[PDB]
Amino acid sequence: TVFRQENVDDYYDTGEELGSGQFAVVKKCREKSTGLQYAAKFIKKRRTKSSRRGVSREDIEREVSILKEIQHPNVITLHEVYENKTDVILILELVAGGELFDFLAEKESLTEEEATEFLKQILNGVYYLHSLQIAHFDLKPENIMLLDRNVPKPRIKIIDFGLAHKIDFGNEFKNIFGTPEFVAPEIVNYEPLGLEADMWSIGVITYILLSGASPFLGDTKQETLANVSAVNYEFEDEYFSNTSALAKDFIRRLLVKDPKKRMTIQDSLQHPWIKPPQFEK
């Protein structure tokens, strides 16, 4: 599939950089014809078929076609796509309040209600995605952004569909591996993956929201991955002493090694607490 090949600078002006990754940089931008603001994500293309640098066209097209499907308050909206010899440029909805990662770092310690307010929105977004058989495969605080960080209950959107896949056969067996702290055991063990992996990541996020600590983090990536595979985590009393038993129950039912025994997104919404690359160089 071909994208718009006109120079993006003829149609947009760019400003502040919002994110910078391995082979993707995000710049705030403004469409000249409307004055509307967006986030332009520049994805580096691969220069040769056998290269390890850049993103394969197959991977770029997958991200774009998934983004084209989705429209929901808790996920970003893709506006248009440009390309040139070096990059594919995705013009995405601007989420101006920053990453949840930074909000948590700057604020520190979310009450149980504040955690549940964020979590309910994440669950609603993932319910939408999973209903569409889309696995995100990279859920973590850095991939959730706030619309406005200066309100008591910030609204959020899930971003970064670079690892997302359609799961039309119940599982996928590809080169899929996210951030060690957040990946499920089946990712660590290179086993087929499905929607269940996202539910594990939600368990990790919930643990972090409530405590400010990461459940499986070791001093090296290999130790984190080993901890994940062994389900080597516990609720530290110093961080969880005023956290309800029902919140712990929720987490416990998500941080389950066997994907078939883990709560699904629908289970998570009915749970009583809620119901109304991977290598060191």
Enumerate the known binding-site residues for ATP.
18-26, 41, 93-95, 99, 160
Which residue from 187, 95, 181 is spatially nearest to 144, judged by alpha carbons? 95
- What is the footprint of Cl ion within residues 139-168 (CB under 5 A)? 159-160
Q: How far apart are CA 103 and CA 109, in angstroms?
A: 10
Q: Is 274 exposed, middle or buried (0-12, 13-18, 19+ CB in 10 A)?
A: middle
From the candidates 9, 13, 87, 138, which is the catalytic residue?
138
> Which residue lies nearer to Cl ion by CB, 43 or 197?
43
Q: How far apart are CA 271 and CA 55, in angstroms?
A: 39
> Which residue lies nearer to Cl ion by CB, 128 or 216?
128
CB of 163 to Cl ion, least distance (A): 11
Q: Does 18 bind Cl ion (CB under 5 A)?
A: no
CB of 36 to Cl ion, least distance (A): 18
CB of 274 to Cl ion, least distance (A): 26
Please identify which residue in the block is written with the tokens 């705030």.
Answer: 28
If binding means CB under 5 A, how many residues of this protein chain bind Cl ion?
2
Contacts of 58 (CB under 8 A, 6+ apart): none
Q: Which residues are annotated as a binding site?
A: 18-26, 41, 93-95, 99, 160
- Residue 198 annotated to the active site: no
CB of 92 to Cl ion, least distance (A): 6
Q: How far apart are CA 11 and CA 136, in angstroms?
A: 30
> Which residue lies nearer to Cl ion by CB, 160 or 198?
160
> Which residue lies nearer to Cl ion by CB, 31 or 112?
31
Q: Does 93 bind Cl ion (CB under 5 A)?
A: no
Q: How far apart are CA 265 and CA 198, in angstroms?
A: 9
Q: How far apart are CA 248 and CA 246, in angstroms?
A: 5
Q: Does 138 bind Cl ion (CB under 5 A)?
A: no
Q: Does 88 bind Cl ion (CB under 5 A)?
A: no
Q: Does 99 bind Cl ion (CB under 5 A)?
A: no
Which residue from 130, 47, 141, 55 is spatially nearest to 90, judged by alpha carbons? 55
Residues with catalytic annotation? 138
Which stretches of the chain bind Cl ion, using CB under 5 A?
A: 159-160
